[PDB]
Amino acid sequence: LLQYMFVPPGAPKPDSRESLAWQTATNPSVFVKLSDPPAQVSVPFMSPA
Amino acid sequence: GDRVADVIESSIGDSVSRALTHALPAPTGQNTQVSSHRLDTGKVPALQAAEIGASSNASDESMIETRCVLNSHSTAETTLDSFFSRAGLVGEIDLPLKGTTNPNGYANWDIDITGYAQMRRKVELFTYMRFDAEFTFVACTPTGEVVPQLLQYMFVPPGAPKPDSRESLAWQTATNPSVFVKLSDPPAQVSVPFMSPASAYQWFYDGYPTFGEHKQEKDLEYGACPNNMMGTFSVRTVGTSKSKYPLVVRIYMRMKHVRAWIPRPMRNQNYLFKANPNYAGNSIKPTGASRTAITTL
Amino acid sequence: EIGASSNASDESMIETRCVLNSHSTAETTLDSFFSRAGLVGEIDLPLKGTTNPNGYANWDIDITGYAQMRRKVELFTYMRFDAEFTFVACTPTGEVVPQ
Amino acid sequence: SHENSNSATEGSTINYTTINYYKDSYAATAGKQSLKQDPDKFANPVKDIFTEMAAPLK
Amino acid sequence: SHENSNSATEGSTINYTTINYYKDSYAATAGKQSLKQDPDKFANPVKDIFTEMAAPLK
Amino acid sequence: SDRVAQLTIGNSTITTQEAANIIVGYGEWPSYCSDSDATAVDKPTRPDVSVNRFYTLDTKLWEKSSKGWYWKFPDVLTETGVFGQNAQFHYLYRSGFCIHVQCNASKFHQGALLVAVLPEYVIGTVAGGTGTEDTHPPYKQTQPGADGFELQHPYVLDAGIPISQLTVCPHQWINLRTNNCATIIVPYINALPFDSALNHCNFGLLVVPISPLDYDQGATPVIPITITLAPMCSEFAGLRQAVTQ
Amino acid sequence: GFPTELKPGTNQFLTTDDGVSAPILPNFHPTPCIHIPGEVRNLLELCQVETILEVNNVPTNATSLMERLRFPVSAQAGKGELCAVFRADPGRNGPWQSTLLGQLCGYYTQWSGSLEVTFMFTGSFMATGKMLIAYTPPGGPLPKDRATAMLGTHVIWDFGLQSSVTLVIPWISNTHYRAHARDGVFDYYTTGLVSIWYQTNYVVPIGAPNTAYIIALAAAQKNFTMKLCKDASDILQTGTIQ
Amino acid sequence: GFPTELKPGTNQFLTTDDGVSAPILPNFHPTPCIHIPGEVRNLLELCQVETILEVNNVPTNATSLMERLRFPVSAQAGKGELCAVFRADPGRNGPWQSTLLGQLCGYYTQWSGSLEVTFMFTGSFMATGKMLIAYTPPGGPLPKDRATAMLGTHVIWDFGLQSSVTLVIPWISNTHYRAHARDGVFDYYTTGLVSIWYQTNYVVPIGAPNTAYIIALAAAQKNFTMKLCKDASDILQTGTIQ
Amino acid sequence: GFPTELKPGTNQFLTTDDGVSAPILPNFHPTPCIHIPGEVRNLLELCQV
Amino acid sequence: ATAMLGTHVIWDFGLQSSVTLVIPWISNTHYRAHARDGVFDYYTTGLV
Numbered sequence A: 001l002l003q004y005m006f007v008p009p010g011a012p013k014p015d016s017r018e019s020l021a022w023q024t025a026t027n028p029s030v031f032v033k034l035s036d037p038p039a040q041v042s043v044p045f046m047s048p049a
Numbered sequence B: 001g002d003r004v005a006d007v008i009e010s011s012i013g014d015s016v017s018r019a020l021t022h023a024l025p026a027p028t029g030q031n032t033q034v035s036s037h038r039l040d041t042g043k044v045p046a047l048q049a050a051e052i053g054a055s056s057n058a059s060d061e062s063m064i065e066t067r068c069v070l071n072s073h074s075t076a077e078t079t080l081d082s083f084f085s086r087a088g089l090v091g092e093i094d095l096p097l098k099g100t101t102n103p104n105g106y107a108n109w110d111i112d113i114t115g116y117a118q119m120r121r122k123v124e125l126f127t128y129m130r131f132d133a134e135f136t137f138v139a140c141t142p143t144g145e146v147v148p149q150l151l152q153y154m155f156v157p158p159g160a161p162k163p164d165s166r167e168s169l170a171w172q173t174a175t176n177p178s179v180f181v182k183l184s185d186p187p188a189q190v191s192v193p194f195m196s197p198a199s200a201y202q203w204f205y206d207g208y209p210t211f212g213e214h215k216q217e218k219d220l221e222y223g224a225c226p227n228n229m230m231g232t233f234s235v236r237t238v239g240t241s242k243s244k245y246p247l248v249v250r251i252y253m254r255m256k257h258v259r260a261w262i263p264r265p266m267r268n269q270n271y272l273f274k275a276n277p278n279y280a281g282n283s284i285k286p287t288g289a290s291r292t293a294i295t296t297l
Numbered sequence C: 001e002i003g004a005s006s007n008a009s010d011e012s013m014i015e016t017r018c019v020l021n022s023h024s025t026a027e028t029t030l031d032s033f034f035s036r037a038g039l040v041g042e043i044d045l046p047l048k049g050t051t052n053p054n055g056y057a058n059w060d061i062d063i064t065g066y067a068q069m070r071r072k073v074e075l076f077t078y079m080r081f082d083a084e085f086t087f088v089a090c091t092p093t094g095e096v097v098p099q
Numbered sequence D, E: 001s002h003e004n005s006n007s008a009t010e011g012s013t014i015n016y017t018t019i020n021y022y023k024d025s026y027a028a029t030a031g032k033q034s035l036k037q038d039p040d041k042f043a044n045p046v047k048d049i050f051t052e053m054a055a056p057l058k
Numbered sequence F: 001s002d003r004v005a006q007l008t009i010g011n012s013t014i015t016t017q018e019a020a021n022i023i024v025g026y027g028e029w030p031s032y033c034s035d036s037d038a039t040a041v042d043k044p045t046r047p048d049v050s051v052n053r054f055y056t057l058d059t060k061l062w063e064k065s066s067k068g069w070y071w072k073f074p075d076v077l078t079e080t081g082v083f084g085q086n087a088q089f090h091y092l093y094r095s096g097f098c099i100h101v102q103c104n105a106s107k108f109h110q111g112a113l114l115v116a117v118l119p120e121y122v123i124g125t126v127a128g129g130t131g132t133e134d135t136h137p138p139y140k141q142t143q144p145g146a147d148g149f150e151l152q153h154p155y156v157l158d159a160g161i162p163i164s165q166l167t168v169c170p171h172q173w174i175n176l177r178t179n180n181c182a183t184i185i186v187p188y189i190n191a192l193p194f195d196s197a198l199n200h201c202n203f204g205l206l207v208v209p210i211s212p213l214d215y216d217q218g219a220t221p222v223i224p225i226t227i228t229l230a231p232m233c234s235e236f237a238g239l240r241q242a243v244t245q
Numbered sequence G, H: 001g002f003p004t005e006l007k008p009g010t011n012q013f014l015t016t017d018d019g020v021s022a023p024i025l026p027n028f029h030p031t032p033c034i035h036i037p038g039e040v041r042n043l044l045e046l047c048q049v050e051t052i053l054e055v056n057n058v059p060t061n062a063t064s065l066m067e068r069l070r071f072p073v074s075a076q077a078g079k080g081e082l083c084a085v086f087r088a089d090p091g092r093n094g095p096w097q098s099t100l101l102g103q104l105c106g107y108y109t110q111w112s113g114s115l116e117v118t119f120m121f122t123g124s125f126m127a128t129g130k131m132l133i134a135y136t137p138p139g140g141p142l143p144k145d146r147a148t149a150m151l152g153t154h155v156i157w158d159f160g161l162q163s164s165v166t167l168v169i170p171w172i173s174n175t176h177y178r179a180h181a182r183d184g185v186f187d188y189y190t191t192g193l194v195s196i197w198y199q200t201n202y203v204v205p206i207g208a209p210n211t212a213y214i215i216a217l218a219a220a221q222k223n224f225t226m227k228l229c230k231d232a233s234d235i236l237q238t239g240t241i242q
Numbered sequence I: 001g002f003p004t005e006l007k008p009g010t011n012q013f014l015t016t017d018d019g020v021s022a023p024i025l026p027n028f029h030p031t032p033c034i035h036i037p038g039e040v041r042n043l044l045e046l047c048q049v
Numbered sequence J: 001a002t003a004m005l006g007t008h009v010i011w012d013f014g015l016q017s018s019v020t021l022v023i024p025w026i027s028n029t030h031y032r033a034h035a036r037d038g039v040f041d042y043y044t045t046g047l048v
């Protein structure tokens, strides 16, 4: 089982497998098994420009 | 009937809460209007009187010469649902083999989301909150491994029999809602309504739950309000023999259809306990970074 | 003695205010009360045991072997209904195997 | 969709637009809501409001 | 949906609203039902009914 | 014309010649509970003038070293006047409040008090200093009565929250060079239509010096801060014998 | 095929999920439903039917169980003495457990409504008397004397032709619903106390018994409703049912 | 059955996915929502409420924390001396961290809008004075002297009846939005510097204090908006919360 | 639930498949697009230079 | 604290040099005779 998380500039980067940041209360995270098909998401145009 | 004047002309009883302000639509940020140099006596936007208790009403246009700017920046992402409807960790349940805590194959989790800082600090921004929620249950061994194990989750509301063992009769679950799922299956997921007896849950209750002398022994119940206690969440491996593998269930909550009232200052000291705002007295830290002098960056 | 319940109401026993009660009565309908799946039978298919060491088993369709469910239905004398049956199978340790 | 009105926001000033497949409204998505806001409720709850160009205390 | 009328509640005073994907009606969901109720059937089955303000025995 | 005011309610009248307007908490006036929100069936009692009036409960002395105090509502009135009696005889209670904190000095004194109202003001303890002891505040501290209670650690309002953000609550300031009083009208705030005046304190009143009092040797050094308040639209229900707690 | 994508919840079996399942007997038509008296449509119908309240829930040996079904009254010394007391909490352990209301109440986490208790005097026709029955809303301790009890909601019952009287326990709550009350923080949802006192005295002439009994029947008013289904606290089974 | 075909993403659990999940309590109806004062609909409402800015974020020992809430002014030597300085970057470590605006700002990656800081003088009524508060847009180093600071956007505050004055930090940016600024390449998103200088001097007569304090309150203008939710940089927890 | 039946292709990840994927940032609105000179719409435009 | 329970005015010194206390007519009888020590204290008005 894996966890992927998007950490935008300013959000706490996880420093370990057990980091509190993985609580992911606001960042978007995805939980998926290697057995499951490839995880897939849509991402918007996020630049400030 | 009513005949005496003071009774006729009385206001005793109007349920209409007269409001001083009303909400206007605001999909985008406010635009900026062209402005020019004003050299007037009498008019003075820059001067305020903070003692009144209201924020400054001075605007860009009146403090400097501005150009016109059509602002179409959206305000959608700062609505309560946008802010809160993101699932976060609120509980962990351990089902070890030869351990100390739960070596019996089952576990009872008191439904309280205040054990995790991230989520907690967010909801504590408001005093009262009313909402529905989506709960997701992620289970696997301690190494994040997936094994062929069947589990049963059951919601035990206040008053229902809490399971005392992996084989407890309560798991017959004839009325309580239960969920049966394999670790191999994707995370179980259900919708939960607003179940309080009150019109809203409240993260703060400055009071006691019962009458009587509030002696030292009972000081643990200060701040405890039953309207916030929705019940127990029980889980167990489904069998009459011990499971071959140790398990961990992470509980994620995603609020939806949210309403909140009364903003509060946001927590600025580390959390210590679920039930209260206790902070470490010998370690009161400032809210943020500090510097050597007020005249240097 | 008549055999009927008291018809006395709040309004006539004490001075009452007006209360617009919008509390729903939906959750106490028979379907709300009963349409919740509960355990009504268990079948064992052991290897070297006493009961069924032959690989099959016959279960007499009777839901009265479990208290929870039983006590609920016994509140009424006659009942007419359709039903949804769910069958959960696994080894005695709650393990899943390719069978 | 003719369901049960048991959503936490039933009877709310803000108009929601959601999706659902069950008879119970609270099972629905979060959807989009109305973008109305009232800053004055918190930033300017004075009894007698003063103008931007005037001297607040007179 | 034009199916078979084999539900246990076919021909019932209480109006049901359900969902189904099979030709057999009993395969349908439980749905929502009518909220009618008749307490008197059990709480006041007297031949000659008496009023709240009167003396029950006269 | 905004610096001068008169508050009259019941058989009591307050005057001030150095005010700074009036705040109406969360922008709405106190009002009786409607037949839709109500749930209890007994007809309430609304004493009106005998309880909706100005009660002057306590005076504290502002010093160059004061930390700040807090009082709890309705705890402050539970043992005062006809209001207190009704609060004791009835299980259910609800009302709004008009709070008027007074503090005058001279044109040569300086200092600023932040006067705010904080709903559901739960108190925390310093947890044994190290945070390893799960201590709880005693009755005397959660419901200090009319005497109020002095704050131990103002910066965190004795509850792990920054006082710097307390202005997000209905409030006013008493800046000696500008005004000598704060007035805040507060509506009933709770998630229930009525509640116990004894077991539940709907909100707390905080009076904290943010800018310390100061003056020169020879100016009157005794600067009191007096608290006056009046319930508004008081309603009570669920009569029985009197109970103090 | 049509592009689909599986979401969380997939494969789970929720016992309360109201879905569609394949029918095992195609074209089967059930036996016609004939008319049967006493159909019930909603549990609330049953909550309005009075059943006996065991105010006298003290004896426990098998031969004395029927005694729990009624309490006594007899000639006193005119000091407005106490007759009996009991909590009004319908979903709590105690007297209400003998009523159908209390039992059904056991299947719901929350309830809201006024309750009523009707007391029937079964003494001789020659016996007379006046009683004071009072309901003490939350916060009030068990009334020391009658003078205290009298301060709450009450009824003064006069024995006579009409054998019974009804005490209405009006819904006086802070919250719109109460969860089952019990010792601990959940006493927050307590309803209150009910106490019976001798208003005057049980009087009887020569030739009639000095002791008679009262039977208490209880049920809910029409504003009563319950919500949030839960299993009852009892499971009447110890081992397997053979 | 109907021909379908599973696509990537199947079985994944995205924490921000806004989908539909089976309800656990069929036909459950929640307690009615009564009226409650102060409902908030959008976080932006809170960003317009002024909260105290810790311009004087230097002392750190527990007993002196309340001092961070205000800075001083006193009689000078008339050389247009410097009073205080601070970065205007609202989502950066420093003074703004004490404001609700800065804290909420912590939950969003980007922000756009004009900010405002209102300064309240708390000296005695007999004290007078004129200050020059200036906002130096990006690129300008910390102003050497007042003459330099004066070249930017500024306000000349005159003490008097109106205790306060408002400095507007107008939105002057190259990009439509700024991400949180910080040392390094992200200083590209810096807002600028704010500096306070003595325009004339703090004057007071015999009998009044030589030192008084200023309290700074800050919030956002109505063109302020934030985008892209992210977790705050702080997690107020060290071990498990018991 | 509704009767469905999986066909071949299920679970595969075709790099050119033009499908729909769950959005990671609900209600996010991108920075407005200002005018920029020289927008190209089709590679053929470049083949004529 | 006790005095405060009756009819009162809270006077704030300032520009307006004066303040007015109204001693409203609160009597059991429509008229009072001159009060004085003894049974005629029945007609007393009260304390300020």
Ligand SMILES: CCO/N=C/c1ccc(OCC[C@@H](C)CCN2CCN(c3ccncc3)C2=O)cc1
Binding pocket: B111, B112, B113, B114, B133, B135, B153, B154, B155, B177, B178, B179, B190, B192, B201, B202, B203, B204, B228, B229, B230, B233, B274, H024
């Ligand atoms: C088949 C079993 O599936 N059931 C899952 C489930 C999940 C959650 C359930 O209830 C969740 C209720 C929480 C949203 C309430 C959280 N709250 C409400 C306010 N509160 C609280 C905590 C500490 N102090 C004050 C308030 C809380 O912790 C019930 C069942």
Ligand SMILES: CCO/N=C/c1ccc(OCC[C@@H](C)CCN2CCN(c3ccncc3)C2=O)cc1
Binding pocket: C061, C062, C063, C064, C083, C085, G024
């Ligand atoms: C492909 C095989 O799948 N078939 C599954 C299945 C499941 C249940 C089936 O019938 C269930 C009938 C029960 C709902 C009847 C329960 N009852 C009716 C009344 N009753 C009973 C028991 C003891 N005393 C009196 C009445 C019962 O136990 C038939 C087939």
Ligand SMILES: [Cl-]
Binding pocket: F079, F080, F081, F082
């Ligand atoms: Cl008194």
Ligand code: NA
Binding pocket: G019, G020, G021, G022, I001
């Ligand atoms: Na199915």
Ligand code: NA
Binding pocket: E022, E023, E024, G023, G025, G026, G027
């Ligand atoms: Na079929």
Ligand code: NA
Binding pocket: B189, B190, G007, G008, G009, G010, H019, H020, H021, H022
């Ligand atoms: Na789902």
Ligand code: NA
Binding pocket: D022, D023, D024, G016, G017, G018, H023, H025, H026, H027
């Ligand atoms: Na359902």
Ligand code: NA
Binding pocket: A040, A041, G005, H007, H008, H009, H010, I019, I020, I021, I022
């Ligand atoms: Na996809």
Ligand code: NA
Binding pocket: H016, H017, H018, I023, I025, I026, I027
């Ligand atoms: Na979305």
